[PDB]
Symmetry: C5
Subunit: 312 residues, 5 copies
């Protein structure tokens, strides 16, 4: 119909609230997730007031096409939400209670600096646009914000679901707008990464390090290059999941360090064989004895330094 008119100049306040039902399909590469929740709205319309005694009823039920309903939209969605109306009720003083169930796909950036052990915050933005006759603002109803106990995300742990009470008011396309922020905090389940990726990689590296206790050139070459091939296959498998980022991450640094270590091991084997052929066995023995202790200690120190750099 038409937005309600003020007494003198006051803005119209709409109280909102979101109750989560389902959360699924978190795509790391596309930075998307899908949601299924309740949307609650409430405002005051004095034109709908009635006398309970004369009417003989306490609550009046309306239809969406029979009264004025504010237009609320989500900002970071791929398309408009698929919503259906559940209930509309009017109090004797004119207060309207609105409820609906929707479904939508949300876009939200992610941070991968600590990819196996990272935490993320997902954002949902609600906006309303002011009409040429009235100014509309948004508020938060704290008793209508929550989530179901059966909400589960495959691979993540859900911590909290709150909202920022203070809205943001600005001007866009020669009109005023109000924005609300709903935040969902999640943590990644990293248990499966240890025995699936972390430990076999260490085993393969330790297997490659056995060339320092041998003097056969062909066996050393075979060991080191074959372990390198296995490392390449594991790196391809891991990289199939991580997206491309404009910064450095923990896993990428570790993989690059492993490549560097393989290169240095090849150089050491080559040097030892060259010295042995040149009839200098003592120097080659000394070099291989040094390397036997040098490689693991440097690996451990570099890993400690990287862990401090990325998590400290």
């Amino acid at each position: 119909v038409s937005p309600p008119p003020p007494i003198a100049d006051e803005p119209l306040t709409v109280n909102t609230g979101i109750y989560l039902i389902e959360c699924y399909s978190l795509d790391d590469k596309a930075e998307t997730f899908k949601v299924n929740a309740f949307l609650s709205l409430s405002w005051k319309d004095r034109r709908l007031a009635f006398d309970p005694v004369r009417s003989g009823v306490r609550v009046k039920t309306y239809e969406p096409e029979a009264i004025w309903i504010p237009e609320i939209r989500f900002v970071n969605v791929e398309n408009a939400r698929d919503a259906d109306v559940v209930d509309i009720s009017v109090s004797p003083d004119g207060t309207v209670q609105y409820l609906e169930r929707f479904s939508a796909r949300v876009l939200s950036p992610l941070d991968f600096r600590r990819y196996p052990f990272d935490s993320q915050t997902l954002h949902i933005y609600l906006i309303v646009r002011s009409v040429d006759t009235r100014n509309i603002v948004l508020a938060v109803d704290l008793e209508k914000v929550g989530k179901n106990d059966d909400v589960f995300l495959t691979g993540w742990d859900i911590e909290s679901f709150t909202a920022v009470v203070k809205p943001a008011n600005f001007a866009l396309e020669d009109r005023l707008e109000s924005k609300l922020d709903y935040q969902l905090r999640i943590s990644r389940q990293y248990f499966s990464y240890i025995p699936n990726i972390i430990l076999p990689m260490l085993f393969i590296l330790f297997i490659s390090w056995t060339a320092f206790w041998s003097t056969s050139y062909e066996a050393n070459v075979t060991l080191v290059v074959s372990t390198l091939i296995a490392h390449i296959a594991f790196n391809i498998l891991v990289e199939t999941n991580l997206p491309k980022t404009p910064y450095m991450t923990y896993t990428g640094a570790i993989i690059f360090m492993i490549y560097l270590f393989y290169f240095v091991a090849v150089i050491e084997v080559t040097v030892q064989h060259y010295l042995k052929v040149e009839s200098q066995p003592a120097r080659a023995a000394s070099i291989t004895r040094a390397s036997r202790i040098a490689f693991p200690v440097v690996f451990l120190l570099a890993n400690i330094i990287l862990a401090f750099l990325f998590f400290g």
Copy 2:
């Protein structure tokens, strides 16, 4: 129109029933499946009673827009169901029979602790919301719950399809709700996993174990590392299907144990060669003779212990 009014205060009872027609597209990674079934509803509306003699008919046929129909919704669905109405009939006393055919996608968690030999239970939740004038509850009609004989799931065996008679009543968004639980029990067909994965892996391990009957260092190195590469390829192929879980599974433990065994075999080969070079052949012979018996027995004992731990 409007919900029927009670005599004094009694709640309105709606009898439900689901008859399965199709079941397909069980996605382990997404924890989803698709369904195609009949939905049956029945309640009492005294305002629709008629006299069979005066009307000359026994059953009156209505349209969905001409009478009041309760709003029933599924809880764990990605979107609202696609339904069409099949038949609406009214008995002379006012009893309404409703039938429809729908299609929907259901979300349900799965347990993978015994992944090759596991059984699952799938859940379908039906809910109804009470209106401001009447209270509505849900019931189960046992003669209208069942499934077709041609219902098939690719890779699973269907056991039963029942419903929990007792509903759950609670308060949500300042209104009362009633919930029903439909359970479908399935079992995985594990026949194909044995000759496709289990036995070739054993063959490859046995091939790698042949290095204990040889004294050539290069051949032993080649055998063990190449078998390791084959193991890595098989592990990648198997892991392409299993999702990531916050707990330990049977297959993952077995794979990790195989990696450990390969590492120990490499260490044994390296030790034997080092002892042989150092002019101590008897100690190397003794070690290799011990290992020849030690490896299979330990493998068998560890497999028995793991099987008891996960299935006992």
Copy 3:
């Protein structure tokens, strides 16, 4: 409007017919295909009879919303068909001719016991439900069943498209139903499988068998294990297409037999080297000479036996 009334008690007969236009997207893993065809219906309604002389016309054209049309549904479809009405015409005696074009996705199980050389039968089920005032049955019009000459399936040969004349009548949800069966017979084009998979595998096996003409342990080990790795890669590539079945197939048996042969070849090489080291060259020579003839003959006999078992 309302279903036509009988004279005394006779059921209403609806003559059906399906004319195929397109067939595409046969998914072996999902056991699905898509269709695009014509649906023809015909029945008698005495309330629509007219006099050709008075009206001055021979055929009267109606609209779908102006007369009664029976509700026909497909049983094994994922969703309801997307149909549009092409023509409705009424004969002077009351016979109605109905035509429409639809599109749908069909679910039908497949048998993979002879996967490269198998034949399949696809099923389409038509059902109708009886109303509370009349009983409805289904019939087949043989002059309206057929297919286009340009219907093609990628990888299959289309043989015939017939229908079972006799319908199935039963009771479901306290009402009578009639079901018709349309069958489409197809055969797989197996030409490409021979030079793409069958012959290179034989070449690789023959290459691995060359180790029986050599006495170098390292070369034999390299040959056999590298050919095993190639076999594993080919097996992964083949298995990417075949779904998982609760029974044994031809290809799986062949692959398992090849794995067994590789294991036995490794054992033979190991035995020959062990005998040679132990200063028993005559026994090793005899064993290798025996194996040279033993392996191909056993392979051929096992292949003949398997072929007789699966196709005889």
Copy 4:
């Protein structure tokens, strides 16, 4: 409303024309492509004639629901086209001009006998069905057939877009139909295939051929088998794109020939080693000297013969 009536018996002629705007998503495996074009129709309706002087206008604009419009359909489409009406105008003599923009997915078979250097023809079929009162035929308007200059297909070169003027008239479902044929000629861009696939394969084969200048059995075995593994990986990568066909193609023949060459090279190495061990060095030298020249010449001759067979 109703189709226009003839004077005595003449059929109704509809002039058609298609103007291409976009062409994209050519799927070789599914044999599909997507289109976005204009559809133009024109016919004569004498019931719509008006006097320009009395009306004071030259062109009258109508709505699609206010006049009769023929039903035109595409034959080889997966679903019905998504169309919207752009303009309807009527000339003073009764000639109607119709314009619309649609989008559709087309099915069309492809020929892969010369897959890297092949040319294809894509087909679009337009059909119309005759009503019980009038006969309708199709014609081609040559001034309204064309394509945009920015139409591009990823990986193909567009040559021409014409139409066959002569329609095909036949009887289907007891009615007459008229069919038109629109053809689009395309050519594949084969530039990228040379340096990406063709030349590295030749390099690998030449690398494998170096075993004829050596007398070390182990090195020869390593070279040949490792090059075979690389060939298998390249063949898998190439075959990921080509679909399965009931005939032989150029690429498949070349790959099979390369497999045959690898097998013969293995046999030659094995024979040379066996002769050398048997204290017959001259015969092995002669054989290897012959093979050094024999292999490339036979390869070149076989390639020339295959090229003549497939392209001559």
Copy 5:
């Protein structure tokens, strides 16, 4: 209703403007992206003028079905946009302000000549078609063109979003059309490509180059061929992302050069062994000493020349 009439002959001017909200899903292989933006339109209709004093209002709000709205379409879209109307307001003099929010998928070609370090320009075309009574042209409103500060593309850096003020007027299908061009400039984030692809490839090549400091034929063969296999795997992984182009790119040239270098290294190893066997050690020593310096210098010079050719 009907387009507004001119005074004598002037064309109707429509001022446009696009405000970006979201940009996502840039597919390199399909050459597509998705957008979510505001569309603003403005024109003059003298038939809607009113007197503010008599009406008592300053702005009049209409509905889309109550007034005439020009038909604006996007040219390079896969389907018609999904739009909803936000606001329609009319000034006292007759100026109409129109606003809507849409979503669409755009087709735009890309250039890959400098694929890791390339910049692209994306194009959005707006068109309008003239009616038979009035001529319509398009203009740009510079105060309504812009983008949000939170617009992000995964893997790209957004630089600017402007529009070409001058429209293109031409004739199509016997009517006049006007076209506008909106351009979006983006730059690829190339940081991740260095440590993920560029440096490990250099490490592998350097590892393969170690064969010039050895005289063991078998070890050299193993090193070079295994590094070649690793190169093939890396090349497959890189090529999985780049589409096929009718021209040469930087990455393809580099990969082809690496293949050439591997071939020449194999030839050098083979020559050295052949000379050594023929009792000419000095010539082989000289050749290997030359190659030790020759290979890296030629590699560096070729890389410099290629970089100058593609970027200079």
